[PDB]
Amino acid sequence: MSQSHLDDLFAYVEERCLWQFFSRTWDREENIEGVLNQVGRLLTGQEPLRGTPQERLFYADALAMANDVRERFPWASQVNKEEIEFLLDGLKSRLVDVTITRSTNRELNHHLY
Amino acid sequence: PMVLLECDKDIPERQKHIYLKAPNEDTREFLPIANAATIPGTLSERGCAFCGAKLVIGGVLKDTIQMIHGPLGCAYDTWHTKRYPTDNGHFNMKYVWSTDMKESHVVFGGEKRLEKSMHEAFDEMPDIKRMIVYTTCPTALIGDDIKAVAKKVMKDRPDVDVFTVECPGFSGVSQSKGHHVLNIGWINEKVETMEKEITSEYTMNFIGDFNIQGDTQLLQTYWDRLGIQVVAHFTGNGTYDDLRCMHQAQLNVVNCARSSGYIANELKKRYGIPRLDIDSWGFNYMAEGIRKICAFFGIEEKGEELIAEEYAKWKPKLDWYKERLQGKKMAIWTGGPRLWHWTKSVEDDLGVQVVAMSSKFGHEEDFEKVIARGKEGTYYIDDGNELEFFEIIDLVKPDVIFTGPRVGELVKKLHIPYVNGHGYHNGPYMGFEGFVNLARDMYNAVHNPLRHLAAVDIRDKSQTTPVIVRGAA
Amino acid sequence: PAEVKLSPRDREGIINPMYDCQPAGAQYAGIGIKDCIPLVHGGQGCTMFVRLLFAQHFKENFDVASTSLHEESAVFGGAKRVEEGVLVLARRYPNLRVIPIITTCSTEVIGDDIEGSIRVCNRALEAEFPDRKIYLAPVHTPSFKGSHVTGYAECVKSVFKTITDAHGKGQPSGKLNVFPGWVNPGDVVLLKRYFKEMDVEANIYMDTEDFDSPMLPNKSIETHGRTTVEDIADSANALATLSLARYEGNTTGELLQKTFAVPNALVNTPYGIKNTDDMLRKIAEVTGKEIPESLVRERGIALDALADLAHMFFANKKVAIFGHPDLVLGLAQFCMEVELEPVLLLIGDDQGNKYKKDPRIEELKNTAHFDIEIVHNADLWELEKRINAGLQLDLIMGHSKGRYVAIEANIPMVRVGFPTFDRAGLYRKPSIGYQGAMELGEMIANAMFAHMEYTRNKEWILNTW
Ligand code: CLF
Ligand SMILES: [Mg+2]
Ligand SMILES: [Mg+2]
């Protein structure tokens, strides 16, 4: 069901990925958006963006997650493009909530690195 | 929930530093305080800011004088204690330098004593033309301006290059502050002060790896196979001048995000070089990392050839250890990052259950990572102390502890074996082969006749002395 | 042209320090006391690096705490960190009795009033724990003078002052006080046996035998100093003090002589045969007890062993020695007894004005038939540089932080003194006394023998010696 699928994706990211745990709020936001937009493209057969260095690295992170999601979760090969997009939008929101909005990590907004 | 241990009844602030992960909790409500002041008198494991700058990062370099501006103890104490080999005869481990600060320098100043020491060091070793100068507690307190001295020395001796770090041991709360001060000064002052030849279409820096027992040299066999030039390693088996070239790289690959994330963040901000975080410990982690690097460069097939060969070579041994280590309980009491690099990798690849973890100096960032990857029923401790370690052992009864040698020698009395989680037993521990090395040491530590022998009281008529049967992969 | 010369290091800086700083030595003094946790007032590295050093030498944990000086205390003073640290120790370690409060470079520079903090803590402790007595000893150990040798001596003296001030003079004990200095558990075991065989009651300060602790069936931790408050308090009541080390405890023997009229006898540190003989003669003199036949026999066994080595393998071989001053001077005498030639003696701190007056220098000047250079305020670069300049050595005797000098120069090396982390079990092997002389001589020969084999230097000769 759509909440079970989203829970599957969120549990995967939390136990596996590092890009949502970068040093500052602005970097977490950039990575959540950049990586998950590429994941959506890869899970729906769209041409990945591989132009700039930053795009190429979001592709690299996203490829690991897209390949793992297809391997772990049969549903991810059954649902349609719009359903994948909806799930990934919900996953962005959840990751911003737990890694930014409700994180008590007191360094996240320090202007200097 | 957060845990008030019995040994902390009179220091109850410690409860906000100890999380026991329980079912259905929102972990955002239970993140340990971290990177806060130490409680005096606790037997905290923490060290000082100077340690983080000189011992951990700067002192790794193979071709650099490590000039410690202070009394001789800070120098003595950071010599014969690390295991970071080089390919030039281990210059970094053979020598340490002090300005030998005396009472007269406290009274009148230490700047001329530093300047004299610096010229002596260059005169005694005329092949060495690079130096890092560090402050220590009393040279900070008297206000010696080591940057100004270094400036004069470089003016007077134009064939040397000197970098300085202000890192007295009372700065910050732990070694972490030393990491930060060094990272930011290096990128501010020394990056893009020279350039090197580019010899590949694919270039990277490897940031946050300090060549413990040859880890960096092992990973370099991967980069050489893949045809990737490493512009600089920060700082394993590195050189001062390679670090001046870091702006040239196309990609920054980070392992130690704690000590070295700062310079990766600044390289991205200033030069546009993307930051890729990996795990260079863990078998299946190493495969993910290689695949990401190769996806970034567009050399995916070369990555898959390397991975296939490494799995053919090492996976059968890894799986032999997994069969025998499955279900064993492990504690990790180290600096911080190895908690989040190891908890799930030993679980996935070796079947090992990490039941307790303590970080000396980790930030809340490090706790986010470890709690995300770690198990329910595990204890997560910020700035743990010795009495807490005993109480935790009684709570979780580990089969093995990955920690430093002194704590290993303490828990031996309780018949608990250790592996050196810092300097390793028989490393390297990074990469595919390295995780097999880690598994071998864990196996030999726990399945050890001496542990069984120690438990037997020969006076007990009722007891015999057993024999155990061991194995090898 | 026969010359024993004292000279200082000619560089202002240090490369490869021989000793640690004063606070490290103060910590070492304190860990030999039962129910003692030293509190090191300063930054955290000043504690943790020394706990590591002890683990390197002994392969054991020892408990030492920090006051965790941080930035606020560096601006406003650190007294509150001392006071908190004392109470946190007392509250969490119910059996704790002794806390040497050891200063560091930071807390000496900023001038924290340690004695004022002790008055605060004494009041607090008396109110919170009415039936407990905790002895707080102020130990002033700025690291910008002296070394861990001086810091050891300062801590012993302060602890003794503190505890004896509290208990004063009582009934005569009939015992000796003995300050062996900074020695291994194996040296302590040997001295206990000597006193037992001579029927002499003695306290050895500090008694570190149990630093070599068992791994027991009941999982008990026994890695403690054995010297108690009571043992230290009873020093006021002794028949006499035997001080074996001029730089490592003699000043406590003098303090007990000034304060309590316990006569102090300083003897040469008992490295080699003559120094051991003279120690036993002084024990006999002060106690009226005869030297036993068992010690004549141990002496004779040692001599018999050394005689198999001296003219065959040792004569005319050139030796460099580094370590604590009492050890360096005593080992130079031992070397001479077995026909070795100690041509270079390195002593690692700023106490040259005292070393110039040491009577053992004169004993060397009046005996050696070869030049001796004694370098004071030395570092270990002073050894490596002299070898690089052409000094020909057959042997180095020193601690493990000199190992790379010997390895790279391809010179055999016997590990002596502190720390000896790069060989196994040396803390258990006596170096003083007759047995110790024999053990040292056989280490030297066995190191030479292995070297002959690895270098193929007449390796066939090890058959019918
Ligand atoms: S926190 Fe140095 S060991 Fe100390 S008493 Fe000073 S000489 Fe000796 Fe860190 S910078 Fe160093 S190690 Fe400590 S002093 Fe500070
Ligand atoms: Mg989860
Ligand atoms: Mg014989």
Ligand SMILES: [S]
């Ligand atoms: S630390």
